[model samples]
Structures are given as structure tokens and as C-alpha cells.
Target: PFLTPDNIASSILYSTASFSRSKPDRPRLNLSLELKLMQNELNKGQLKKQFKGDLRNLADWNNLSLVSSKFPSLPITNLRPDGSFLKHRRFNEEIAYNRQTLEKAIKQLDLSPDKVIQLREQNGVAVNGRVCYPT
Candidate 1:
């Protein structure tokens, strides 16, 4: 039980473990490390917004990762080099094509569309599996 320090670091620093990856029926999102990277961006001002000298009310937008976790069927998306988690394009596309789950996504998120794309770059949507980009 105590022999997993190295294993822990590898899984946290590198990528998701194959142990859970193979199990398609996994219950929760393994965002342990991804959230760490996301947090780095918030601190670095990747997604955090401000008007004049005051910060904007983006506490809700910060919940995108949490918003993502509830939908297991949605493919896992990553925050790349800048740490911006912009998925509004997919959200609109899903809303257009599917019109069910993604509607709830937009309703729940309820944030600006273009702003997020500007904050988080538009590329790198992970489907079927997760990918880890080194920070």
C-alpha cells in the first residue's frame, strides 16, 4: 500500500493511468492533475479577466472543469499551453447536432462565447481518451 509514491508522481505528472483508462465503466473524471494545470492558468491570468483595475465575476467560468466532470459521455478536453479551457465551439456544435445534454452544458456554464475562445485557444479537443501536455 505504501509502495506507490513513484507511481503516484508519474500518474500525476505524466498522464492518466492505464489502470482506469482501460475501464470504460469508470465512475468519475480523473482530474487530479489536470485541475492542477488549470489552476496554474488562473493564477497566470490565462482565463481570469479584468475590467480596468477590478477583476470580473468569473467564479462561475472557473467551474468549467467541474461542469465537465458531470458528463462522463462527453470526451475529455484538455487545457493546452495557455491553460484556457474553451469548449464553446463544441458546445454550440453539440447544441446544434444533439440538442440535449449540451444544452444543459451551456445553461449551466452561461458564460461569454467569444471571450473563452480568446482566453483558451481553439484546438486540441480530446475524444475517447485523455492526453497530457507537459506544463
Candidate 2:
């Protein structure tokens, strides 16, 4: 199965990009921006801002769903049951809900938000997680 983190990020990126490119009239999509933030937090080592931007463009796109697309190993089918080529939210949840979910997941993982934040910022990507997203 796919790790929940990758699934969430993929879902967020797909939804955000589709909305942004297709429905430009509506409110700004937060998925892509947020995914970029979260990915930076989870990366293995230091990377430059330009690299971060490039990485964001890659991760934030539907083409590069995760580090290993061949072996997705995610519950992607369960996450998107509609069968569309594009991405959809699992259980009809929205982007905000996903952010809240991430917050809760991080807490459960016992990852320090301060550490994630500091590391990401030092590496050049702006991001913050939900401390109380479990609700």
C-alpha cells in the first residue's frame, strides 16, 4: 500500500493543479503550495531554493506522483475511486481537511514541527504544519 504521506501529497497536488489550470476564476488552490511545503519538510538532506522550486514543480505535478511511481505502494485506488485520469479526494475530503490530517499525522509520527519548520526554512522552502490538526 502507499504511504499515507505520499498519497496525501499526490492528492493535494493533483487537485490543486487541476483547479488552478482549469478553474482559474475560483479561489486559489492551496494543494500545490502546501505539497511543496510538506515535501521540503520530509526530504532526506539539504537542497537549494532553486532545487526546491524545481522539486516542487516536479512533486506538485501529476506526472511525478512520488519517488517510485512504478511501485506506487499507496492506497491510491481507495483514495480516488472515480476512475478519472486526474486526482480526487478520498471520502470527498477537501484540501483543508488534508492539511488538518497532515497535522495530526505528524503529531502521531512524533516529528517535531519546529525541527521540520527550521530545517525546511534553512533549506529554502516556506512551510508549517498543523499542531492540532487531529480534530
Candidate 3:
């Protein structure tokens, strides 16, 4: 949950949200950085820096997922499942197939690339996760 870096190759999955209802209504600009969960992990300063900035920034439940739009009034969350949120990605058949295909493609991506191999060796712990990782 602390985003300790295990890079699994998939398009993406929007798991959890890092939100604050505290400064509601209107443009809450400074809140964006607050959404990067790693920052809250005691991962501050230079130790946090080498951990690359490519992590996923999850969405606040402010209708971004549109569950409140199409199927409004359903319980937005229940504090459970999939390492972060409740159920998500009830994909249609085509979407399901497409994702499976993408996953298979990544299955073939066993990180056998010579340059990327060298890059990992050269990059130190700066490279982690799947594409790369973090501390």
C-alpha cells in the first residue's frame, strides 16, 4: 500500500484515491501533489527523488470515475479489495479482450532488451518496479 515498487506491465488500473475534502468547492490547485501517495510514505526529500516520478496518481471520487454519473447514488467506496479500492473496471467484452491481449504482449516483454538491461545496471536503484522501480 506504500507503493513499494513492483512493476507489473499492464495498461493501468486506477486503484485508490488520495483526496482531501478540506478545501472544497473551487480550484484546489495545490492539492494535486498531495495526491502522489509516495510523498506521504515518509518518502520526503532526496531519498524520495531517486524514486522516479512515473508513479500513478489515483483519482478522487469526485465523479472522476463516472460511477456517480451513469449509476448515480451507488455507494462510492467500501474501504476494500484489490490492494486499494472497491470494485473497478467492469469492462465490456471487447475491452476485456483488448486488455488480455495487452497483458499477453507484456508477457513477451521479459525485459530482454540489451539496452534496457544495461540501463538497469547503469541506473542503480533509480530503476525499479516493472518499466523501472522505486524504493
Candidate 4:
């Protein structure tokens, strides 16, 4: 259902708002902040599209465990009875591993403490010798 294009915008707005409100320092009514959050989500969606078959491969139409909840008469189920339990468990592990791997890679790409300090000293992101973090 997420593949549907129309749903993406709605999901981004609501999901970003939900995330913003949960952050203690964030203003709930700040549309600009919400839009910035959605920009991050847009990158995530591109990643998902690039890895389509990874998650969907778990589905076994011929030997289904149960129909999907959203569609009562849907022919295919995302689950399989034979070793599906193990497969699902492994799937979760794989997802967690992938997430951590990507996280580490991104962290490496970002500005390190030394780099940030150097930039601050050069007045790259500071104003009047004070680092400003706009809430």
C-alpha cells in the first residue's frame, strides 16, 4: 500500500508532525521544522524503493499462513508456515544489522567533533563567537 504515490505525502506530513511533537524542545506548530523532517523522509523512501525485493521476498503466495489483515480476500500472505518463524526472526536481525551498518557509514560521513570545532573557530557556522542552535 505504501507504493501508492498519493499516500506518501500524507504519511510524510503526519509522521513528521508525530516525530516533532515527541521531541521535548521542538515546537509542535512549526511548519518549517516539519518540512525539514519530511526532507529527511524523502531520502529514506528512495532507499526503500532501491531495496524492494528484500522485504517482499518473505511473502509466499502458494503456501500462505494467513491472509493479510487489510485485505480479507487477498490471495497472497506475507507469511509462510514452513520455517517462516525462523525466517521472520532472521529477517528482523538482518534489518537491524543493515540499519546499524548504514548508521555507522553516515556517521563517518558527517562532521566529526574535531571538524566541527575547526569550523566553529573559523566562524563557519557561528555568529559573534557564539554557536547558535535555532530551536
Candidate 5:
């Protein structure tokens, strides 16, 4: 039983294993990454005011993506080549629809202003007494 580097390494190799594991029962909202794309689009002076309103919740952003996805005929500009996001550089039917839907969803959630701000700043929410991440 001499103490050698090899013996020490071998002794510790299997000491840290765990037998139990679990998964999240529910998905958490993760609009953090998506918000960057949203901000960049709004940074353009012409598009800033057009996107006026609270964007504190991931659901609000989700609603925007939904409207764009559902309506293909709407005229929108893509800052990136893939066109994954929109700038809404010019107001149109799609922009109007997106705003209406986003606002409606925000209202439906019945979230307080403070809660919305907290979600936006924290970029995540606590659920079931744990920090939950997007599914």
C-alpha cells in the first residue's frame, strides 16, 4: 500500500461518481439570447420608436416570432442573411399585427411592472424553488 502518484490517482478516480439524476419538469423561458437580436434591430434610429412598449417577458418576444412565422406575406427586413429576425424598419400589417399580439399576450399574463423588469434583467425566473432554464 505504498503511496505513489499512480495509486493516488486510482484511489480518487471513482470517488466522485453520483448515482441519482433528474430532469426539469417544466421548461423555463429563455429569451436572453433572442433579446440581443431584438435590441440590435431596434438600435437603428428609424426602428426604435416602432418597437415601443415593454419587452420584459420571453412570452412577448415569443409572440413576435409567432406572428412573423404565421404571416409570410408581411413585408419585413432581415438584418442578417438568414432572415432569422426582423427590424420592422417600416411599419406595415405584419408590424401592426406583431405589436398587437405582443401587447395582448403581455396583458394576458397579468404580470406586474416590477416582475416584468426583474425577468428582463435577470434573464431567467425561479420556478418550483429553483432557477429554471429554457427547455
Candidate 6:
């Protein structure tokens, strides 16, 4: 489980769940989140380029909380200061069934390596379980 609402607000304002930190039996949600983040960035870029002055603000990159609220079904889960169910953000390992499942999902998504890293940073997935800055 995750921290409570009060702790969630005080701990840090970023998601820390990752797939690499998952146990063998657990699925790697971090990977899926990374892929989706990358895909969104790519799409944002395309939209920004195509729309020029008429483009809508790319909330996915500019403000993830906004995107999360708009697209509740998206990967980025929400959390309140009280540690309540602001949104249903499940554990990563529990979601991934096998290595092949993760691999298949990654293969299906069109994402770049750098974009993946950016996604990880935005979500704070690679920051480990600790909520510290040096983590």
C-alpha cells in the first residue's frame, strides 16, 4: 500500500512507484508508466507543432496533475494530502503478469529512450522507495 493523504502531501508531490523495484512475481508498472509518458510527450510535440498559436496547452508535460485530473484513466494516479483515494493508483508489480507481458506492452508503445527517462523523472519513478531528494 501507499502512504496516507497527509503523508502523501508532505512526503513529496510526485509519484514514486516503479517497475524495476518490483519483486520477481510482481509486474513492472514503472515501465508502462514510462512508455505512456513518452508517448504523451511525443503527441504533445506533434500537437504543438501542428497547432502553432492555436495549440492547447500541453498539460501532460507542462502540468501532469492537470492531465491526471482530465484523463482519470491515464497512468498517473492522483493522491490527496489526507492519503485518501483521490484516484485509484494500483501497485505496479501486481499489474504486470509476466516478463513477456511487460515486453509486449513496451514493444507495442511508440516511445523513445530519452522520453522514457523524462517520463520517469516527471513521475519520480526512479527515485526509489524513499521520498528523499538524494534517493
Each model's backbone clash number: 0, 3, 4, 0, 0, 7
RMSD of each: 15.6, 20.0, 18.6, 23.1, 17.8, 21.5
Stretches of model 6 off by over 4 angstroms after superposition: 1-78, 81-103, 122-135
In model 6, the Cα lDDT at residue 75 comes to: 39
Query: What are the per-residue Cα lDDT tens digits for candidate 4 across 1-135?
Result: 554687677667654654444564543444564355355452143122322234344234343322222223322222232212212223434444545654575566777778656533431111122112110
Please report the candidate that would top TM-score against the real structure: 5
| Model 2, runs deviating above 4 Å | 1-63, 67-93, 118-135
Residue range 4-66, candidate 3, lDDT tens digits: 446332212323223345643323334345444334442342224423443342333342343
In model 4, pairs of residues that clash are: none
Off by over 4 Å in 4: 1-89, 111-135
List the candidates' TM-scores in order. Answer: 0.21, 0.22, 0.18, 0.18, 0.25, 0.21
Q: Where does candidate 2 have its weakest 10-residue lDDT segment?
A: 126-135
Report the C-alpha lDDT of model 1 over 10-86, residue by residue, as the tens digit. Answer: 55644443324456343323354334534455434333332122233333444445444433343334332233344
| Residue 49 error, candidate 3, Å | 28
Residue 103, candidate 4: how far off, in angstroms?
0.9
> Who wins the lDDT comparison?
5
What is the TM-score of candidate 2? 0.22
Q: How much is the lDDT of residue 15 in candidate 1?
A: 44
Candidate 3: worst-modelled 10 consecutive residues by lDDT: 126-135
Q: Could you tell me the TM-score of candidate 3? A: 0.18
Assess each prediction's global lDDT (C-alpha) against the native.
0.40, 0.36, 0.34, 0.37, 0.41, 0.38
- In the range 1-135, model 5's lDDT, one tens digit per residue, is 766777676546433332222532222223443355445554343234333334342234453444346446623333222223343333245545655666676777889999867544432212222211221
Off by over 4 Å in 1: 1-40, 44-46, 49-63, 69-87, 101-135
- In candidate 3, which residue pairs get closer than 3 Å at backbone N, Cα or C atoms, i.e. clash? 7-130, 128-132, 128-133, 129-133
